[PDB]
Amino acid sequence: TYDALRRQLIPSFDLLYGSAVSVVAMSVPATARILDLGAGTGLLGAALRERLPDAELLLQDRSQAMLEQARQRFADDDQVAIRVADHLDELPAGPFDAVVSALSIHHLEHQDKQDLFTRIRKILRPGGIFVNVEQVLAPTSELEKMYDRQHEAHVLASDTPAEEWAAGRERMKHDIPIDVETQIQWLRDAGFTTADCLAKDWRFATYAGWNGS
Ligand SMILES: Nc1ncnc2c1ncn2[C@@H]1O[C@H](CSCC[C@H](N)C(=O)O)[C@@H](O)[C@H]1O
Ligand SMILES: [Ca+2]
């Protein structure tokens, strides 16, 4: 039900989450240590586990209530740990082969995003990857209205319950998105040697930075 509702709310869920899993699987070994930042109920971690059965996953979030759903999702998994931490709290020591995030970093002020990308690179192995499945802003107000129409079109086409879309619109008041190319440049500023947008559906995009590749 929860997972079904995320697909109803998020355009191109399989393309965007799938692209995150694929780019990690082509960038790190089977036995990678992976941090999922703002893991929530652990959906991105779960997508990674399906492809990488031997990866060690650390799921981190500020919300014990969200992480309880992740604990249930990963009940029988001996290679998953859970950590309660804000993005602005001290990160785990690492090192990590990959740091991944979905629909979380857009909650931070822009300066805190720029600092976070830098802090993430410091806990990555050389050649390590940062991947974000993210809600992004259009480059202009007029395009932002078109992004909004395309998002609403997916939500309506998916037969999303009206109450859940209303609750979605209210949660989105707290969002601090920026355009995808600005955030990709922030990865270059943080010292990532390569950064790219792998996949995009208007308001939603999967992008990555490599720490030396
Ligand atoms: N500053 C912050 N530090 C840590 N987690 C944060 C945060 N701001 C928001 N979050 C978390 O970010 C998540 C956004 S919802 C996305 C959850 C999950 N990554 C998924 O793809 O389904 C929530 O679990 C919320 O608690
Ligand atoms: Ca949000």
Author numbering: 17 to 229
How does the study describe this entry?
Here, we characterize the O-methyltransferases BelI and CysG, which catalyze the initial step of β-lactone formation. Employing techniques such as crystallography, computational analysis, mutagenesis, and activity assays, we identified a His-His-Asp (HHD) motif in the active sites of the two enzymes, which is crucial for binding a catalytically active calcium ion. As expected, BelI as well as CysGΔN16 adopt the class I methyltransferase Rossmann fold, characterized by a core domain of a seven-stranded β-sheet flanked by α-helices. The HHD-motif enables regiospecific C1-carboxy group methylation of their respective malic substrates.
The crystal structures of CysGΔN16 in complex with S-adenosylhomocysteine (SAH) and BelI bound to SAM were solved at 1.5 Å and 1.95 Å, respectively. Notably, the complex depicts octahedral metal coordination with bond lengths between 2.0 and 2.4 Å and bond angles, which are consistent with the binding profile of calcium (Ca2+). The ribose unit is coordinated via Asp77, while the adenine portion is stabilized by Asp102, residue 103, and cation-π interactions with Arg78. Notably, the N-terminally truncated CysGΔN16 variant was active with metal ions available but inactive in the presence of EDTA.
